[PDB]
Design a binder for this molecule. Sequence first.
Ligand SMILES: CCCCCCCCCCC(CCCCCCCCCC)(CO[C@H]1O[C@@H](CO)[C@H](O[C@@H]2O[C@@H](CO)[C@H](O)[C@@H](O)[C@@H]2O)[C@@H](O)[C@@H]1O)CO[C@H]1O[C@@H](CO)[C@H](O[C@@H]2O[C@@H](CO)[C@H](O)[C@@H](O)[C@@H]2O)[C@@H](O)[C@H]1O
Ligand SMILES: CCCCCCCCCCCCCCCCCC(=O)OC[C@H](COP(=O)(O)OCCN)OC(=O)CCCCCCCCCCCCCCCCC
Ligand SMILES: CCCCCCCCCCCCCCCCCC(=O)OC[C@H](COP(=O)(O)OCCN)OC(=O)CCCCCCCCCCCCCCCCC
Lengths: 174, 124, 179, 64, 59, 486, 90
Amino acid sequence: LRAYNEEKELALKQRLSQLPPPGKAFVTAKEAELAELAEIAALYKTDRVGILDILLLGNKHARLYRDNTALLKDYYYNGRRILWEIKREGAEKEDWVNQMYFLYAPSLILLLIVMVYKSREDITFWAKKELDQRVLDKHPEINDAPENERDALIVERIIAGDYDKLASLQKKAT
Amino acid sequence: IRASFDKAEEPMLGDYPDIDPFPAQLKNPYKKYDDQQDRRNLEEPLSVNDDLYDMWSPDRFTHFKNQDALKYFIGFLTIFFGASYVATYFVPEKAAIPREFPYEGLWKESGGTEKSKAFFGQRS
Amino acid sequence: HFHPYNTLGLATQSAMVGLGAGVVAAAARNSLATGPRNILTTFSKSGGVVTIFTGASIAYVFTYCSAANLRERKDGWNHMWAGAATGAVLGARTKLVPAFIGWTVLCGAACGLFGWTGARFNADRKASLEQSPKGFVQEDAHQTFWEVVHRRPLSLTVEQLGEGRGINAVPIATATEAP
Amino acid sequence: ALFTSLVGASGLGFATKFLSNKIRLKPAGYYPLGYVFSGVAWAGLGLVLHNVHQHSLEVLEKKK
Amino acid sequence: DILNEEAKIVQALNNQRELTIKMHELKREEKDYAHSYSPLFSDPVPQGGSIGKAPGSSR
Amino acid sequence: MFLTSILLSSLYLFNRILAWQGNVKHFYLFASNLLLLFIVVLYINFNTFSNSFQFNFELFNSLNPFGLSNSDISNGLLFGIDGLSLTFILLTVLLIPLTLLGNWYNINFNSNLYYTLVLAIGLVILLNFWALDYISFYILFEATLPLLFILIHIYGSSDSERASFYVLMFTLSGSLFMLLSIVVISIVLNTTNFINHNLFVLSLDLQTIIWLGLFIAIMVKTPLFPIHVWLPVVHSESPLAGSMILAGLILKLALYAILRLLLPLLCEAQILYTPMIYIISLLTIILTSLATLRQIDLKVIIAYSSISHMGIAILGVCSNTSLGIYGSIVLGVAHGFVSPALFLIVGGILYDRYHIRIVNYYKGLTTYMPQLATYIIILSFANIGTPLTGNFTGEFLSLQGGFIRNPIIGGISCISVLLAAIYQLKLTNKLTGGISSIYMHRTNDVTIREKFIMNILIISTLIIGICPQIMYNLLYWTVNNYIYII
Amino acid sequence: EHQRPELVSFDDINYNDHKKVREAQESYTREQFIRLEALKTVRKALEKCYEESGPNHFEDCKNLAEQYLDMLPTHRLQGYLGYQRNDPSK
Ligand SMILES: CCCCCCCCCCC(CCCCCCCCCC)(CO[C@H]1O[C@@H](CO)[C@H](O[C@@H]2O[C@@H](CO)[C@H](O)[C@@H](O)[C@@H]2O)[C@@H](O)[C@@H]1O)CO[C@H]1O[C@@H](CO)[C@H](O[C@@H]2O[C@@H](CO)[C@H](O)[C@@H](O)[C@@H]2O)[C@@H](O)[C@H]1O
Ligand SMILES: CCCCCCCCCCCCCCCCCC(=O)OC[C@H](COP(=O)(O)OCCN)OC(=O)CCCCCCCCCCCCCCCCC
Ligand SMILES: CCCCCCCCCCCCCCCCCC(=O)OC[C@H](COP(=O)(O)OCCN)OC(=O)CCCCCCCCCCCCCCCCC
């Protein structure tokens, strides 16, 4: 539930009405006219919005706000192009970087994480264990072998026996 | 217009100026063009089918004629494989027998079964 | 099976029909026009229509009957060859070769598309859903066109597809059995 | 269900009033009781078509 | 618990398929003279034009 | 009442962001980004052990027209996923914030129109891959075309009239024959359905002549040889978003539709008629990858590159073998990464800077843009099919699957590695090398957003190129669901 | 927990119920992966035979090499639509 001010929001338009257009206010290739603008351009940045203030108001405030922001935007970016204005530090955060680094990128990493650990349940990893269980069901005496010996005593059954039971689903064939 | 494909595009152009296509490489380099890299003045009319006559086009040798060059290449290809084939008739014979192996030709060592002894095994 | 066609008889019938069509079209062209015209300019300022209606009508049915006789069957291909001949007649009015080749290819393809569907502007009464057995089959019946079954016989699919690619007269696993 | 079949036809009504405002070059909410009028009218059309479909289903049920 | 929720949908589509086959067969079914035409006055039989009528005209 | 209340709240929030903020670039980004958070949680609850369709819903049923329905009689519009259907949704949803981002600082005139059209023709191609009837697949197979027509006509570069007419005309002209072949199997079977049609056989004389109506319908959409008239000249005049979403999403749809529609009820009509598919796919690979050499324009080259890779892909599908199906899927998921990155390079970055797309102006890009010439080279060498990039895994398996089915056509078609190297490296060394050009003032380096897009579209190729198995957990049923080798 | 669902043939399961049809599809599929793991196990054994044998691999496991080249045409994925759409002996 952030805040705004109404009378400041009217006085800002009263301030802007006497100002030159954005296509003129910076095309003079200092501080007589360029010093009022370097504060007004920071009125774009100063972040008076309101979280719950957008919900609980009428459109009379909304149109007034929207026209004021649409002029402060030009006074910021035109002065950024020709010339706070007269500084240089990096990097001035943009408009898209909040919901591409903090919603797009972590969901897009979470997608990689889920794809890696969903690959654990695979048909090869299940078919190997099912084939070993099918060996140990018919011939459970190789369970009595030691733990190191069983991995070579299953393979002699696999190589030896068929153990596939595909021709038993095809009883119409023979 | 020199090549047979440049001639075959005369009825398409209607307002195109139809200039003479000349390679960008065979221009001299010592004239100071706008583009020293590609040998081309700033507003110079490009040819019908330019990108065979670009600097980035093929190398386009200029010493031999291409027809002659074809004859010389196939001439070397012929004089190698003809001489090396005729020289197989003038070969001398060997002084040794091929060597021999035990165990009925090592049929069992390189695979094999008693019925299958023909495919595997050498020089009993 | 079939019966061969009288090429000369069908061609001279179509020649008479093309004659009558050329006459009625020249009579239509006189009256649906402007400027000074009389009885004699029926065939003077005719636009050359009676040659169109005559030549197309001869060439189509002559090529059609000839193609149906030398192939000894009737399908949509005969309409393709006959429409190619019709495009040859209609292409010669514009005395240019790539035009002519285009007329012969495209009119022949359009007439072949007409012939393949049944060579009819209307429908066939029988052999369509409202008047043909459709739905599932009831017993081990020969599955006709328009019908569905659940499992085709393997001896039928080996006759239709072949004995090559992956399809075989015995499935591959019971072909490799322990006894 | 009857209720969603009312709410959807009422939403069609809100779309009619909205688009009729936007052809006349008015704002979105111009005469905001007119949304209530169109919602009730098109919802009544949903009532009618819902009941006709009910009775048609019952006529099909009675044929067995 | 998903094979069952498929069997439900496939039954719900085979029911609609049999519904269509029925309602497409119920169109082509021939209809009575009392359903198709005038419900009362169910006969097609005229007795038309009785003022100067002649005995022996019925058949 | 609850899900109605969510909509009545969200439309109000949309209204108030329309009122105070001017653009809805931020709320379209927020919505299209939350689509990821939704679809990944759908991926978590996806049972991979079942061939079955997991998440099913009918819209527009009789008993409930505005919403969901649970009845014993269904005539609405079915929707659901498995596997196959889900890899392409995951391809989609991580790309649509990138095209929505892709024109961020660009539009300047009726931006609210443009981003609405782009987001809408992305949501329609989500629900393409959700669909389950033949009609519900088809009623969104051309809900794209209106908004594509108007997105090309307005906002197209120059001579966008003709391109907009082509994207309506060619797609529609090939699409009506698909409508014919859908009508025929909806009056024979009386079912539009993607679940039951494995059961239904047809007569070979019926199955023969309805495969034509779908094959010369996908011949237009993945542009095969009597088509691809329209592909480069819809690209070359498109805007930036409608080129990425065309070449990354609209093309792979018919790769999905040859799997979903054709292969499992046309089973016996294909094995007679695959060696026409091999003719057409080979002489798109031989012909359209050879007309790339003589191209003056710079976006048209990447257009014909898309044609050549989609011609490799459909001789992996039509192999009736097990490696080719998975190879064509990994082609469709990796070309949809590497190719819109190339459209960001050609009409994305370079047309924003210099506004003319002729090749002849552009040389010496290295001396003033080093960290763009890197993205020229690694992304080109990803398009050719260097290994470890995910394009080679697909090219390799699809050439192998097309080598099983007919080995002479596979041996001839193997030359595509050469033919795809020729034009791409010829373009790369014209752009990368030489003295920085005369015509060209030095402009900005590639900026933070046009790196943020690129590194996503490069890592997402490299992960598939290092492990193509990260999506075998989805696809291993659909490797089997389409083989008819008895 | 390694679950083992049942085997359902396509023969006599009445292709009007989608329960037994889909289980028959998945069962023929899963048994086909099992049929493949025998190929993938003999290949793993043949390579160990080769690497330990060294020069006499020609005669130590001629049987395993010929074994692997016998299984290779007939242990792969083949499709349930071949056996579902067609019946032998009809
Ligand atoms: C999607 C774009 C693709 C365009 C395809 C359009 C062309 C489709 C044509 C094929 C089709 C319509 C089927 C269309 C259904 C879907 C149409 C889909 C969209 C339509 C746009 C028209 O078939 C026509 O084919 C022509 C040439 O092939 C013939 O030409 C002519 O030949 C000469 C006289 O024969 C004339 O003297 C000559 O003047 C013409 O030359 C015609 O005779 C024939 O009627 C086939 O219909 C027919 O097929 C036959 C089996 O063959 C069926 O009978 C069967 O008999 C037993 C045999 O096993 C079995 O008991 C059983 O199997 C079945 O009982 C029929 O029931 C019937 O149905
Ligand atoms: C029988 C045994 C077989 C064994 C081989 C037999 C000999 C085969 C020899 C030919 C094969 C060589 C590989 C083909 C690619 C050639 C590429 C090439 O050479 O590009 C070089 C060219 C610039 O090089 P250059 O200007 O000369 O450099 C001078 C530096 N001072 O750069 C360029 O700008 C060239 C751009 C065009 C590249 C060539 C395009 C045509 C390629 C022909 C391939 C044929 C495919 C036909 C497919 C039909 C299939 C049915
Ligand atoms: C142009 C004509 C085409 C048809 C009109 C266009 C479609 C209109 C939008 C309707 C379709 C999507 C929205 C509603 C269906 C999904 C949400 C839902 O409520 O159902 C939950 C869904 C399936 O339902 P179920 O799993 O059975 O659980 C319900 C138990 N009662 O459980 C799930 O698995 C969720 C699946 C959601 C994914 C849907 C596809 C994502 C794309 C959404 C696009 C929506 C476009 C809306 C545009 C808004 C503009 C104001």
